[PDB]
Amino acid sequence: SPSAQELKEQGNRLFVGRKYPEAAACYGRAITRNPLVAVYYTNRALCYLKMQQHEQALADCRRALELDGQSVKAHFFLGQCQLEMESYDEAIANLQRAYSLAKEQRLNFGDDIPSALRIAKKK
Amino acid sequence: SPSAQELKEQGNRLFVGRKYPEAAACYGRAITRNPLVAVYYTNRALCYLKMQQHEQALADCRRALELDGQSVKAHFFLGQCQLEMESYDEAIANLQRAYSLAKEQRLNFGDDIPSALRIAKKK
Ligand SMILES: Cn1ncc2c(NCc3cccnc3)nc(-c3cccc(NC(=S)Nc4cccc(C(F)(F)F)c4)c3)nc21
Numbered sequence A, B: 001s002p003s004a005q006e007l008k009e010q011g012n013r014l015f016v017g018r019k020y021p022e023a024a025a026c027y028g029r030a031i032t033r034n035p036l037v038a039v040y041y042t043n044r045a046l047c048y049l050k051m052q053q054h055e056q057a058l059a060d061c062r063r064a065l066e067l068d069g070q071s072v073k074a075h076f077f078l079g080q081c082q083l084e085m086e087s088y089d090e091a092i093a094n095l096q097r098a099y100s101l102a103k104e105q106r107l108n109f110g111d112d113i114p115s116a117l118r119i120a121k122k123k
C-alpha cells in the first residue's frame, strides 16, 4: 500500500538514474493515489520531455497549472515543452512568467530559485 | 604554437570533464591569440559560472555581447549570471532576449535552439 508521497520518492530516485519510463510510471501511480497534487504532474512532465513525448508533457504541464497557477516549474516545463514543439511565442511567454514567479516567490518567501531554471546552481 | 581554435577545442574537451579552471585557462589562451571572438568569452563565462566566479563571468558576458550583440548564449549566460547575483529584473530581460534571439535566428537561418537554453534537447 505505497503512499502517494512514497511513490513520488521512488519516481524521483528512478529519474536520477535516467530511468524515465519507470519514473513516469511511479509519478502516474502517485497521481492515481492523489490526483490533486501539482508536483506529481510537474515531475512526470519532465519525464515525458526526456522521453520526447511532447504532447503528454504538455498535458501534464497544463494540469499542474490548473491545480497551482503559481507553479514556477510548471510554467517553465510548459515553456520548455512549447519550445521543443516550436510554439515559440507561447514558450517565451511562459518562460518569462516562470522566471517572474521565481523572483516574486524568492522575494516574498525566501525560496531558492528552482535549480531547473539555473545552469550553475551551487551544489 | 597552438592556434586559437585548437585552444578552444582543448578547453571544450576540458569543460566536458568538469575541469573548469583548466578549461577557463584554455579559453583565456584562445582569447589572447584572437581577442575579437565572442564565443571564446561566452565559453569562458560558463566556466566561471561553474566556478561560482560571478563577477568574472559577468565581465566575459559583457565582452562577448560587445563583439556580437546577436549572441543567444551570451545573453543567456549574462541572464543566468545576473540570476545568480540576484539582479533579477536585468536577468529576466536578458533571458527573454536570449530566447527571442534564438527564435529569430531559428526562423531566419534554421539554427537549432542552442542546447544551453533547452533542458530536453534530443541527444
Ligand atoms: C525546486 N528546487 N529548489 C531547490 C532545488 C534543488 N537544489 C539544488 C540541487 C539541484 C540539482 C540537483 N541537486 C540539488 N534541486 C532540485 C532538483 C532538481 C532535479 C532533481 C532533483 N532531485 C530528485 S531526487 N528528483 C527529481 C527528479 C526529476 C524532477 C524533479 C523536479 F521536477 F522536482 F525538478 C525532481 C532535485 N530542485 C530544487
Ligand SMILES: Cn1ncc2c(NCc3cccnc3)nc(-c3cccc(NC(=S)Nc4cccc(C(F)(F)F)c4)c3)nc21
Pocket (backbone or CB within 6 Å): B012, B013, B015, B016, B042, B043, B046, B073, B112, B113, B114, B115, B116, B121, B122, B123
Ligand atoms: C549552440 N548549440 N547548438 C546546438 C548545440 C548542441 N547540440 C546537442 C548537444 C547538446 C548537449 C551536448 N551534446 C550535444 N550542443 C551544444 C553543446 C553544449 C554544451 C557542451 C557542448 N560540447 C563541447 S565539446 N564544449 C562546450 C563546453 C562548454 C560550453 C560550450 C558552449 F559554451 F558552447 F555552450 C561548449 C556542446 N551546443 C549547441
